[PDB]
């Protein structure tokens, strides 16, 4: 089996989240029958949000330095439960020697097989930003809807202040109104384009199909380390 | 801040829940408020009950393995979510140069300064077995009560036919009378030296403080890394 990396603590609740849901979604008979995972979860990694609007420091030096960490420490290939980051995975890429599973590429061929061209996307305003989701469903023939100027203040105030600040019943609050509101506009699927939204949503809150990157990824992670 | 280290994989979900339970213990107000934590969940560590009590593998050789990973990682001190493996946390320690914080004497500790001299331990019949509990304890001058090898089968069965099978009608009422007896016998406190135990077991069922291990370790290592 390979080890699984986790290059984590964007923030700390979804990484504990993707760890914990890698555990349930792995089959076995006994513990030994399963697989290794390294996690580094790394707090300290300035806000990738920020750094896209321009407000904050760049969180390369230290998503690479995590990278190496891992690398060292043992793992065989690289997952990371932050969706804003995968803004810079080329970046991260290209200086180390181990392969990183993309959570927005995997989300996106899940979505391809389910046959939906259309996905309402609940995510940080530095995801929406950077492309990360459009220039990948592009590929993939999927059209992406966001909420507006002022909806989407909402989301992020249900990630910052709600989810990363352990108020999670706010967090839950506001991304549950968005994701309704992305409902009313035809959205055919809800994207849980923000690890922080994987960890408050769940499919029984909502009336059209939850894709969630987080057990996308945590599936894949799994057959890969396993299979291998 | 200190990075926490946590040697785990005994049992994997053992190992996800001790996080969870860090991360929702840490006062943050955002991401860069949590401290660093290097897991490494190795499922392929030797059973430590099954090398105790009869034949298996020596688990040492591994145990010291990840923890050196741990430290070489970056790792300031190590804690670790398994009551058996504790047997071997002298063979541990001396193999590394960072420190290593056990479960079992944390809440002997705990309780030994609440003013209690006698508790009652819930824990499977490996875990009674080894020990683990009994040493450490008395060490603070702390009596282990535990139930009649009968008595002992209601447990069992509450954890697995009950608790872990779904069942918690059956795991409630097994877990509950055993804690309750432990009680009359003068048990001034709970142990639940299972998971599984507190799931179904609250404090508001008993009229002795209900103590879990895994709450009291995560909770020293926040407190550790945000230093102590």
Not at 72 to 79: K, N, R, V
Not at 162 to 168: E, F, M, P, T
């Amino acid at each position: 089996m390979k080890t699984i990396g986790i290059l984590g603590g964007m923030g700390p609740l979804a990484t504990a989240e993707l760890f914990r849901r890698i555990v349930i979604k792995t089959p076995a008979k006994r513990d030994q029958e399963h697989p290794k995972v390294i996690i580094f979860n790394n707090p300290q990694i300035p806000d990738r949000t920020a750094y896209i609007l321009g407000k904050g420091e760049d969180p390369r030096p230290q998503l690479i330095w995590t990278a190496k960490r891992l690398e060292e420490c043992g793992a065989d290939f690289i997952i990371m439960p932050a969706n804003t980051a995968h803004a810079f995975v080329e970046d991260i890429r290209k200086a180390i020697k181990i392969p990183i599973i993309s959570m927005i590429e995997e989300t996106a061929k899940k979505v391809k097989e389910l046959g939906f061209k259309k996905a309402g996307l609940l995510a940080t305003t530095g995801t929406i930003v950077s492309g990360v989701y459009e220039k990948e469903f592009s590929k993939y023939g999927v059209e992406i809807m966001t909420p507006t100027e002022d909806e989407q203040k909402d989301v992020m105030r249900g990630i910052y202040e709600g989810v990363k600040a352990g108020n999670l019943k706010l967090g839950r609050e506001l991304l549950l109104k968005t994701a309704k509101i992305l409902e009313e506009r035809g959205a055919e699927c809800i994207i849980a384009g923000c690890t922080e939204v994987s960890v408050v949503l769940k499919q029984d809150d909502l009336k059209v199909p939850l894709i969630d990157p987080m057990d996308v990824i945590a599936e894949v992670a799994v057959k890969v380390a396993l299979e291998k």
